[PDB]
Amino acid sequence: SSHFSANQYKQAFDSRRLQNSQIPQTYKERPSSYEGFTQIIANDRGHLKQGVPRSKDSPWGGFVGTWEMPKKIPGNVTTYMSRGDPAIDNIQKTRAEHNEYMRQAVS
Amino acid sequence: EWDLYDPEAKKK
Amino acid sequence: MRECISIHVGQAGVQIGNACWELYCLEHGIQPDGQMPSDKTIGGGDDSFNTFFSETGAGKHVPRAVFVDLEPTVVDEVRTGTYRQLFHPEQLITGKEDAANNYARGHYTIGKEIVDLVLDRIRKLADQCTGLQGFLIFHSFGGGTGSGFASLLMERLSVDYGKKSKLEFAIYPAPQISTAVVEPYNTILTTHTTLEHSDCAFMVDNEAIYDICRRNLDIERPTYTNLNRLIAQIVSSITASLRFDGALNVDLTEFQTNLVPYPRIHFPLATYAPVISAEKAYHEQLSVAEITNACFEPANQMVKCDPRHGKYMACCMLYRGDVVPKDVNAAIATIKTKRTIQFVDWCPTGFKVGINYQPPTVVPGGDLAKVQRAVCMLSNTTAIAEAWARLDHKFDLMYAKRAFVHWYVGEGMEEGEFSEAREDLAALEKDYEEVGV
Amino acid sequence: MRECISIHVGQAGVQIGNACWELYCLEHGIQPDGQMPSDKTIGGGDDSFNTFFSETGAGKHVPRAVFVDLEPTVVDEVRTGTYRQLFHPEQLITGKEDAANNYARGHYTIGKEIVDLVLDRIRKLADQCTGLQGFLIFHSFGGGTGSGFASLLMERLSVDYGKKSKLEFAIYPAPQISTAVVEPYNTILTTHTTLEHSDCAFMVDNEAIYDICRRNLDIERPTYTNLNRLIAQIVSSITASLRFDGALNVDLTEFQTNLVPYPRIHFPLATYAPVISAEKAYHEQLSVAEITNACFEPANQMVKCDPRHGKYMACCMLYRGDVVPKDVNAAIATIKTKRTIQFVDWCPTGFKVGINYQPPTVVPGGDLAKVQRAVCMLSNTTAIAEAWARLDHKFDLMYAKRAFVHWYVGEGMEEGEFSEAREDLAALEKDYEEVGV
Amino acid sequence: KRVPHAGMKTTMTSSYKTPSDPKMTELFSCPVDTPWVIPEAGPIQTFSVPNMYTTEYKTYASGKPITV
Amino acid sequence: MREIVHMQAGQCGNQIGAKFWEVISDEHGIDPTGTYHGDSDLQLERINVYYNEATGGKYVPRAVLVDLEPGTMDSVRSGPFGQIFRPDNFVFGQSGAGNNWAKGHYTEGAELVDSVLDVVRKEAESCDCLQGFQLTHSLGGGTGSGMGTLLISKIREEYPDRIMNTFSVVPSPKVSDTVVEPYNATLSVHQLVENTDETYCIDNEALYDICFRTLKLTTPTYGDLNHLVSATMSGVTTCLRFPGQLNADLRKLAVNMVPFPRLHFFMPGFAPLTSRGSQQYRALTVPELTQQMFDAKNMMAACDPRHGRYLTVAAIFRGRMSMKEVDEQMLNVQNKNSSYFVEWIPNNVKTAVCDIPPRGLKMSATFIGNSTAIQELFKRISEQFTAMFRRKAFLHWYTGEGMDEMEFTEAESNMNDLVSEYQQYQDATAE
Amino acid sequence: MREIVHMQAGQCGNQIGAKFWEVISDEHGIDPTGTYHGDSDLQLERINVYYNEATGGKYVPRAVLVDLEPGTMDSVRSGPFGQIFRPDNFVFGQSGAGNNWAKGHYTEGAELVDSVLDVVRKEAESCDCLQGFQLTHSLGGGTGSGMGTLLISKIREEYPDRIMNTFSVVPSPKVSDTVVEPYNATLSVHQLVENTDETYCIDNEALYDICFRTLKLTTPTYGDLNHLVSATMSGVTTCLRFPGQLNADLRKLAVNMVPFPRLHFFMPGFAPLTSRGSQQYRALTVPELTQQMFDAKNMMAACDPRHGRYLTVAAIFRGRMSMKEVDEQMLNVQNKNSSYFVEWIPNNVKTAVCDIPPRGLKMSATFIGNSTAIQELFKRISEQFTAMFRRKAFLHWYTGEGMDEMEFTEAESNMNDLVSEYQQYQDATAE
Ligand SMILES: Nc1nc2c(ncn2[C@@H]2O[C@H](COP(=O)(O)OP(=O)(O)OP(=O)(O)O)[C@@H](O)[C@H]2O)c(=O)[nH]1
Ligand SMILES: Nc1nc2c(ncn2[C@@H]2O[C@H](COP(=O)(O)OP(=O)(O)OP(=O)(O)O)[C@@H](O)[C@H]2O)c(=O)[nH]1
Ligand SMILES: Nc1nc2c(ncn2[C@@H]2O[C@H](COP(=O)(O)OP(=O)(O)O)[C@@H](O)[C@H]2O)c(=O)[nH]1
Ligand SMILES: Nc1nc2c(ncn2[C@@H]2O[C@H](COP(=O)(O)OP(=O)(O)O)[C@@H](O)[C@H]2O)c(=O)[nH]1
Ligand SMILES: [Mg+2]
């Protein structure tokens, strides 16, 4: 669940030149540094103990299937130029509504 | 097991 | 390195794919069983086929195509045809029921049945490709698989692959020739869906290619085979520079940049010259200036839309053969000095020229004569607003009485998509008139 | 030295053991009767068979297996089959009556008379071998001896062996199809009593292998022999590093420590790639990247579940044949950059890869194509919480109305055992949910 | 009595046939041979220049007058 | 030991530079396999200006081939004189910017500049003097304009004082060959003005006119165009590469060319040029060499020098001649054409003479000129830019790849200031 | 006559050391049977360093082979050059650690370290000078890490003054190769810091890119990977075996690099590296050799010395060359890349030169670096360790093999302290 970069070897190990032309999964490269010792924050079962902060995301990840994807996809325009102001408002509105639909499907 | 799923089994 | 994944959706798309893959096999010297003709010496140890045909370790050249149709036959005809050994068995995808000229069936109920499988095949082909130039989607706006499932596949491809180039070949509905009644409904809905999920959608139509076959080739019974052969020649002249040596090289990712001025104006025309028969090729000189004038003549068009009524916004000229750039510049400057051809004031530099050394390929048993030079001309006139007006008038004519709507309602779409589709096309027409003025 | 005793329990275990030992004898060159075929390797000792075979003074190779069924039908078929001379007679003990799909009957009343004999035979087979790696125990959760007697066997093996590995190959019940009706009871009970006594339980669910044979192998009506051959190929790819030379050797003790994060979660999923047939393997090459993508594809797992709806804990990739570590690294890195594959946050590094040079062995008359290379993936992921919750709901629907409980009550078992088993699987579902946060 | 020539003969199987034609040679090779041979530039062509590859330093202590 | 690092980017770059290498190799006696089959030691004395010594007689060119898409680079490495280049000097991408300055400058082109600068740094610190870098790029394209100007900017930051010579194939007055070439040309010349110290503007229509009029040639093909351009690349380096009566390297040429830092756009020229059957009418001499140089026909730009005023002009002669004859010819040209030269600079002609001519020719001459007629080219590009920019056409393709309108406005104003500077120095009087 | 004893632990150690004995038998002329068939007497002239002499012409290696299963040593024995090892030096158990550091260090490796120690003590008292020990293993396995570190601890208890070398195949940033690598590496580095004199951290991914980009080679195979590692060891050790103009043994190397006792983690590098078909374009000079050394892509670890700062650099030129070219190239690379060099150590490069290049090579060069950039590797390992130890991933194996959690906390604290001192000496200034 991490890559932590490869310094010199960023010529390879990107998805586009690894013959994966889809959208990359972004990780946290340039790993950080700690001072030493960790809190145990878990029992012998893998459970998070009482008191620790827990993510509000779904424990099964987010994968919106074909039959629960929204029937409308925005368009991936990311330009907002030479459009009318109602057109830009329409694109922003449908982007917000479809992001809300994906968040509904995830959680 | 070709006799079980031969496409011409019921023909032949 | 050059990779084009060719998706043929619909019965029209699959038949055009048959023609184009016959043409590419002939051009790269691949037999219909998918092998070099028992020799590795034609072209030497070449790998120029890599743009279309994936190659295994034994000599089998499997193509990079996905043939999709919900109905059986046609795809099963490819399965049991002469090109049976060439195509991979999972490359040809077939459903049980037919979309039955219904955008709702193609987009919501039956189209979503196979879309995960088609995307899985496209994903495997893309992972096999060593760097995609883009997708080539062949379909028709007539309705069903070529409309609803084509729009759905484009929408999901825009979800998954992001900013990947998608070049479209659409059989646009003819102005008066029609083989269905819900062609305006399907065309309006498909265009509304694929305004944002598209890059550059080349248009052809059967009526203008019929007129071309009747006038030039002198064929009194042009079937779909001849139509698909000219469409195959068009797409081959489009993709020739990725696989043949040329003086000016053009790739698949420049047709959006040099032909789409504004993000909704992405519906270019298509022309091929010289479309000629043998007895007329014996008479005609077929020089560079002659074919260059023949491209801009408003009778060689394949979209059945007179470009004198509109203004040219961009052009992409694709010369192939023993054509010289000096005469190319001379002819394309005489066209600019000509007054019949009229350009928009905001595009002085309105041409993209690409010259390839490879002469055009003559199919055996074909109808085109053997020529040494050819031009594939790719215009972006605003004359197509006439066709949009005629289509929108037909849509409103059947929509005021709300005819044929209950099929779409019962198969999974409400009146809101109809209304916003007509609104989007009216906005598109206003955009065309604004970019014209 | 790298010895592995295989204990096959039940009809399912005996039949998959038949297929496994056919594959083992074929790949080690053993004739079915008892010996090497005379002139084959006269000077070469070729002592790679010592993992699964022992040498006597008569020059007969004797397998290190124990076949147990409480019904003398499948064991009698083995004793009268083609491999009637391969097996030692005391390695195939059998009972007089079967459990007839009853955990209580197979564990408490008629499973107490075969347990002493099977532990005596296991003791003899362990004292005969020097350096035991672990027990490969092949059985089914469907009920009877595979759920009761196998669990009693693990309970005794925990007492008298301890730290030795106990790799289960367990037939998991299908989401839809079924043979018995009290198998939810049998599965819940056997899972409750094997959670703290096994080490790593590979799920080899039958419905997914049915659809795999229907999809990749083009078999309209697959059968138990085909599924047994696939499971035999799975276990051969698992154990091949103990017999053949390999670049990255993996033993039985690495699978537990690399696939079991917590002592409750020890149920990984096996899958194979490619499982393509010959007429389609002719069409395209099967490289390391393609077989890795085939393993990570959702419609190739040998359990009917979608791993995209869960989160991976840890994957094991056993590459087998003509594979290279750089293509392995490139494939795994491409998988990690893919978006549809998501790992759990506490496992930053989450693969265990073993490269082996021996190609897969082809059984004559089989269905799998001959390939240069293949890969067995053993993935531990949270996606099987669907299977656990569905099976638990099937248990609850029957235990609400006390259906089929009087059999277990009469055959020496209290309903407190049922209550504790249900509570234990509740805790298991809570663990599987709580891991993913 | 089914008609013999147009009775059962599908359009694709009658049109998209396997390619076979005696004129496949002209598709990839011209029957007209090339009317030249061209060698590289030679020493008699690069040394036909009068006083070639010599500079003005070579007229010192040479004994010949400068007509160049 | 003034080394020169060569850089060919884009399709036009990878064609023109390949022709340049196969016309330099014949002058220096390098065969297609890379060995030295030379006639005199003068070819081998200064071979380190363009080549690195290898095992045996092998000499590998110091060229970097940059492209975001294979293609014409495969064609030039599969053609003749393509196996002499080192395989590590072939930095290629996989997508291609493709007539998009934004895509070539601020996208996947920018994740190749690390490898290109690694190769350039290797070939640069494998030197001792390092006169300069030269680029062969193609204003009007995606990977020629954008990526090329990005390389120019980065290498100018790394090496400020060294020469940054560029050969720019500028857009044409008639015929476009690219729809977005005003945008690409403006956005590239904005970088060129601030970064490069000398830039030679070659125009394809001018090459067509020369090949069609001075050379007839019926069917020219791009090989002859690249040969003309390559001959003028060799004409400005022949003083470094061979001894002469009056040497002038690239820095001497720059100093005697540019009067002000923002006037580094020259119009090159090579004028021993006859037709096929026209050797019998022109017995080549210094006076007709000079009038063929100063003729408007044999100028490789659409800018007519009669529609302007020659600020400065340099002439690199090669071959055997008299310095009195050369200087009298240039004085006679200046004295006859007084109004076509600026009156506040006397003797606008900088002459250099090399003893070694190109092979075949008895003697040759290279013409380069800083004139005020290049304001016509920049004004045409400004006119087309302000035609395309008022309606925001073909501009979402840049702003979606990630730039803003402020860069276009700044580039337009910079090129307008360039036009204004050329105009005010055209009509400036002495007193 | 200074002897060193070689130990291999685990699968990686066994294969890498088998290839190492193969290459150093090839360069000394030892045939697989064990006799001598060398050309010159210099091959056997210092044969006592790595080989003990049996009766007759048999030259057994000074090697100890440890793995908890017969396994990989079975493959090595039934491979080429596997009959030279003494059968009494194969020390093995029955169970085999399942990539468990606790099993390799406390349970399974506990009742085999006595036999390994008796073998090592015998084979070391058979020596005459006993310069030191070198061990090949990985920090990602069960018996490679745990048993190897136990061996290191016991050997440092036995002989506290001898030189200790470890070759430490570290976990890779990309791919996994084992899922319990953070635990194994954190538990092994905590032992390597306080018990090893010098450590060459070697990365599979860095070796992959070295073998596949700078050598092409398509399918690289662990034979070539382990041979690159073995070539680095030979270049390290060569001053014991062959004469030179300026020799440097292991103690000179360790004194001239290691500034402070807990900073002995190095990055190796072997820098003749020619791709297939580029030797014709290769120039084969001392500056090119030094440039191929001091390139970041040529390191055998994932860490970037351009991101970090070099503390001490050791360069051994194994072959015939000039003190001019060597010393001036070291001075030039330092003075150009003074940013990637600590200012408080003036001229922080040790130079050694041998006289015998590899067979089939004119000159070779091994590179050892002690940059502060290697803290990135420990940061990666420590962060993955935190991510696992927060949720107690795979910890029940380590706790059930009789080992507590304060061992994990102490190991993590020691690694974080190591990163702290590396960063401190990176950002510390001169004055
Ligand atoms: N050029 C060309 N056009 C075709 C061909 N076949 C069909 N068309 C056009 O396609 C339009 C109808 O769309 P179809 O492709 O037949 O419909 P579909 O994609 O199969 O979807 P369904 O109707 O639901 O089966 C007609 O108006 C034709 O003009 C062909 O072979 N060549
Ligand atoms: N893959 C596979 N599964 C089998 C095979 N035979 C039986 N099964 C599975 O086993 C289940 C039936 O229960 P069994 O395992 O045969 O019961 P048993 O172990 O023989 O014990 P009893 O019920 O007392 O006879 C079915 O649901 C099958 O899924 C086989 O040959 N191959
Ligand atoms: N002189 C010359 N010009 C060329 C050559 N090839 C292309 N061009 C010019 O370059 C322009 C197209 O630029 P292009 O090569 O596509 O730019 P790129 O996409 O960045 O590589 C056209 O106007 C051509 O006139 C060549 O070989 N010689
Ligand atoms: N370079 C190289 N690395 C290896 C080889 N064999 C194993 N490795 C590395 O060693 C690590 C696994 O350690 P392993 O050998 O299993 O340790 P062990 O379990 O204690 O024997 C992996 O990260 C591999 O990359 C080899 O032959 N060459
Ligand atoms: Mg149809």
Ligand SMILES: [Mg+2]
């Ligand atoms: Mg039974």
